[PDB]
Amino acid sequence: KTLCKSWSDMKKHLNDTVSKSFIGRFFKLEARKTTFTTELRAATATFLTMAYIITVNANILADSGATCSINDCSTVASSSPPGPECVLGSNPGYEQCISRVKKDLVVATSLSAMVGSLAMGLLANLPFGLAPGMGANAYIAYNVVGFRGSGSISYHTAMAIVLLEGCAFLAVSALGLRGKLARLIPQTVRLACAVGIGMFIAFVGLQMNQGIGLVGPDKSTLVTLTACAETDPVTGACLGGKMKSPTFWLAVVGFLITSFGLMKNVKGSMIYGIVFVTAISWIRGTQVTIFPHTPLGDSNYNYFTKIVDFHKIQSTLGAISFTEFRKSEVWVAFATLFYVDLLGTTGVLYTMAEIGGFVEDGKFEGEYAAYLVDAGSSVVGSALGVTTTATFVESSAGLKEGGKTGLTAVIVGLYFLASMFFTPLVTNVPRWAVGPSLVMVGVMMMGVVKDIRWGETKEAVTAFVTILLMPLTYSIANGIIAGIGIYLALSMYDVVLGVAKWL
Amino acid sequence: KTLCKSWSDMKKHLNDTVSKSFIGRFFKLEARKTTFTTELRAATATFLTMAYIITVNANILADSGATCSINDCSTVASSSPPGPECVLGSNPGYEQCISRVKKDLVVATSLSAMVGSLAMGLLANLPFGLAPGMGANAYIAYNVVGFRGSGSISYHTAMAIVLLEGCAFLAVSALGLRGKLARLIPQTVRLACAVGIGMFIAFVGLQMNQGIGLVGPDKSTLVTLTACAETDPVTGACLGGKMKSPTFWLAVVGFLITSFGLMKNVKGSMIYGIVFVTAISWIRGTQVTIFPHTPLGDSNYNYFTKIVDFHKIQSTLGAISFTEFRKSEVWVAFATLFYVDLLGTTGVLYTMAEIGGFVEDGKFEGEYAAYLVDAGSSVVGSALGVTTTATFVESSAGLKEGGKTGLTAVIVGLYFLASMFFTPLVTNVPRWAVGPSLVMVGVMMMGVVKDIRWGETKEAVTAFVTILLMPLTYSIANGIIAGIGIYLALSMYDVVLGVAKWLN
């Protein structure tokens, strides 16, 4: 009976003195009952969920070869490209440009979502967590630019397309047809959109590329477990060992730790799994370290010794040129992504309003201006260096413990600013460390399943195929498109009968 | 015009004649308030529901190279054909094996189903038929024996596993310690295993070799949408041009008709999604036919001319050799295939009991006989050439029509008897027709997912990992092992300390 009531004294004086203020009447912490003491609960735990983009976005875009083309890769003994534009990693110039673009893209992704959430939360008291999503990295790099420049489209022009993409969605946001179309998408497809997100995100954290490294290529089955020790430095082809690697059996323990932490309702355990892996991977001398004795890894400690740095942006702000646009091979991709981005990112934003009970008559408060920030932050992000903001479907974590009113996004943006200053502590995380967070998000997104009306068949066939295709095709567009196409065909007779009585 | 009243005139006296005879006393027609007129509807409705797996079985178990090996290929300009050349296709003598094997397992499946279902009819008084159950076929095909000699062990020990599984499954119910061992698993793991199996059996129906051919390989990512018309002339690979495959659209149309026929509650409808595509891909002239102008086409075309034929089994007899049991990777497959069989029959039989009025305060009339005969069906259909047997969920179609006697199953078996007389008409089913029927199984088996307590976080992780890992590893044994290894660790560190404290 010593620290019980003593610690409770400041709780009562804090939430009461902050409610009866000008901020308390701007953000309306008097109606729609939710308190400051609960909004911290709703937003802090939200922040650690979205920690993987500080790494996986830069990891994705660095493989595409953002900058340092042949002029910088080939600088030692060969003027000609060492294959398709310096594919091999044992090339000087490359080894430090990759480290530079990782820093630059980490800065870019920490600075984009700062204003992505702050602006949207300061306009319509909306508690969500907009940030540059995974719906565009799997395409813009791999299909347009390819694996380290293995494509006919340059990266500078790719940023021009992604820039003009947001400008075009700025017009439709000002027209409001995007919102009126959000009530036209079928209920079942909209519900199945969220489960596919969790399944696809869970799948992307299991490869050697940016995950733990379970799956691997196979000659006849295309998929097999190849978490071996003796691995191909370039691909996932095993040289032998068959699941005797420590990279697995050091992220397994972190996954167990975070699962055990969420069992007993610990406040924040998502970062405990990250820390328990990063701390051991930071020790020099072991076989699971991120610091080999190679000069590529040696230069890391020469910078890792610095713990705090501001690191003003050097060589990714801009890189926009209307040079390759004169031909037709650029507008085909532009149109391919054009009527796909809205069809793959409008459903998720509208879904979160129904989960939080925002809609009262099929329309939630501040609907028209909600899409303005989504359409605008993509413009500033594209020129800065990141792809479009896809309005992450992740604030469901924040909606589960009293996140209803605004100012939730601005305080998450405050943490996003905080993560920037510790730039040596984000770019130095292993790619086998952030892996469990993805499958954690995926299992977290299993709660929407027990809401779909599975009793009927017309509402059950579309959902299964939509769930199946997106992870099994490694594409987000192919799921919603297939769900729409399957649902439309089954309702053909009803539409025909409805238009028959139109006569 | 007196036939309208004559309908009832005979519909009554055929009921008295069967009921007043010793046949009515054999099946107890007077008891349970059942007649003979309802038997035709109770049998045909169930037959049309299970009619789908009479050809999917053949197309699934026919891609294993069950009976011939590298020895009996054709001859080429070299001395002898090497290993990895015959098994990849594009050879006369290996395609002759595949034709003579597809012509044989169709008869084998029907013959095994006769023994599975007639015994139900004559020893259990429980109206549901049994054919080699769908769900255990894919495991044996694509994790045990592999695709055309893939994996590490062959077909001979694949059939040998079934004998030893049956010898033990008979002696887990003979002493009655079956349900005493079934509760070793928590409820979540089996619920996740069913949906994961439904997921895996659907993912296999979307590839180039087996399904339509949607997905494909990639150098950077693992899977991507190919749907290419000009495939690789020898292997399965894309060349150029996507989403314009003439074979792809026909399967989509067939799936659409199947899903449409499910609506309005048509009793047997998914066979329409097979016959409609087969009829289109039976006539020649176009490029989506199964009868090309290649010598394989003419040899196969002078087999569709005859409609009926008594195709005898001559190659796929019992090939039981225990020469490979002295190593490890066969016991894991035996254990997994024993495991998935326990939760299937037990989890379905009670669900069938609570419909129709058979259910009582536990241990209803058809308790003992059914488990023993179902276990014996696996060992009696083992040496024939097919996998284990399981009760079908879609058997409720005849049950929901008042079927309550054992005369239903024996009549159901008689319809399967006529299937082997129609052997040459069903071997010619294309490998782009099974696709929609293979995908459809997942929709039917995933409807139970709304039972896991997703609110609790301790079991949601295990259910999700079990769901995820099986289709993304191309195996069934891997996911259940991973789920057990995760579920065990979340409890022992918290329960062992309490048990030790209570013990001290």
JSON list of C-alpha atoms in Angstrom, two decimals, chain A residues 47-48 50-59 102 105-107 109-110 415-416 419-420 422 425-427 429 434:
[
{"chain": "A", "resi": 47, "resn": "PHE", "atom": "CA", "xyz": [3.80, 2.87, -33.52]},
{"chain": "A", "resi": 48, "resn": "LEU", "atom": "CA", "xyz": [5.87, -0.30, -32.97]},
{"chain": "A", "resi": 50, "resn": "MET", "atom": "CA", "xyz": [4.66, -0.10, -38.29]},
{"chain": "A", "resi": 51, "resn": "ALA", "atom": "CA", "xyz": [8.39, -0.27, -37.48]},
{"chain": "A", "resi": 52, "resn": "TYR", "atom": "CA", "xyz": [9.20, -2.59, -40.40]},
{"chain": "A", "resi": 53, "resn": "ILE", "atom": "CA", "xyz": [8.90, 0.13, -43.07]},
{"chain": "A", "resi": 54, "resn": "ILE", "atom": "CA", "xyz": [11.90, 1.92, -41.56]},
{"chain": "A", "resi": 55, "resn": "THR", "atom": "CA", "xyz": [13.82, -1.07, -42.98]},
{"chain": "A", "resi": 56, "resn": "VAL", "atom": "CA", "xyz": [11.84, -3.05, -45.57]},
{"chain": "A", "resi": 57, "resn": "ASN", "atom": "CA", "xyz": [11.07, -0.05, -47.80]},
{"chain": "A", "resi": 58, "resn": "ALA", "atom": "CA", "xyz": [14.73, 0.97, -48.03]},
{"chain": "A", "resi": 59, "resn": "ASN", "atom": "CA", "xyz": [15.69, -2.69, -48.40]},
{"chain": "A", "resi": 102, "resn": "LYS", "atom": "CA", "xyz": [20.09, 2.70, -47.41]},
{"chain": "A", "resi": 105, "resn": "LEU", "atom": "CA", "xyz": [15.89, 5.96, -48.04]},
{"chain": "A", "resi": 106, "resn": "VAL", "atom": "CA", "xyz": [15.71, 5.46, -44.27]},
{"chain": "A", "resi": 107, "resn": "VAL", "atom": "CA", "xyz": [15.77, 9.25, -43.92]},
{"chain": "A", "resi": 109, "resn": "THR", "atom": "CA", "xyz": [10.75, 6.98, -45.07]},
{"chain": "A", "resi": 110, "resn": "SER", "atom": "CA", "xyz": [11.19, 8.50, -41.61]},
{"chain": "A", "resi": 415, "resn": "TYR", "atom": "CA", "xyz": [7.70, 9.26, -32.54]},
{"chain": "A", "resi": 416, "resn": "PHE", "atom": "CA", "xyz": [8.49, 9.03, -36.26]},
{"chain": "A", "resi": 419, "resn": "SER", "atom": "CA", "xyz": [13.31, 7.57, -34.82]},
{"chain": "A", "resi": 420, "resn": "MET", "atom": "CA", "xyz": [15.11, 9.82, -37.32]},
{"chain": "A", "resi": 422, "resn": "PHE", "atom": "CA", "xyz": [18.86, 7.56, -34.06]},
{"chain": "A", "resi": 425, "resn": "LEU", "atom": "CA", "xyz": [20.29, 2.33, -34.89]},
{"chain": "A", "resi": 426, "resn": "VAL", "atom": "CA", "xyz": [17.84, 1.64, -37.75]},
{"chain": "A", "resi": 427, "resn": "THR", "atom": "CA", "xyz": [20.00, 1.04, -40.82]},
{"chain": "A", "resi": 429, "resn": "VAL", "atom": "CA", "xyz": [19.36, -4.02, -38.13]},
{"chain": "A", "resi": 434, "resn": "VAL", "atom": "CA", "xyz": [12.43, -7.49, -38.67]}
]
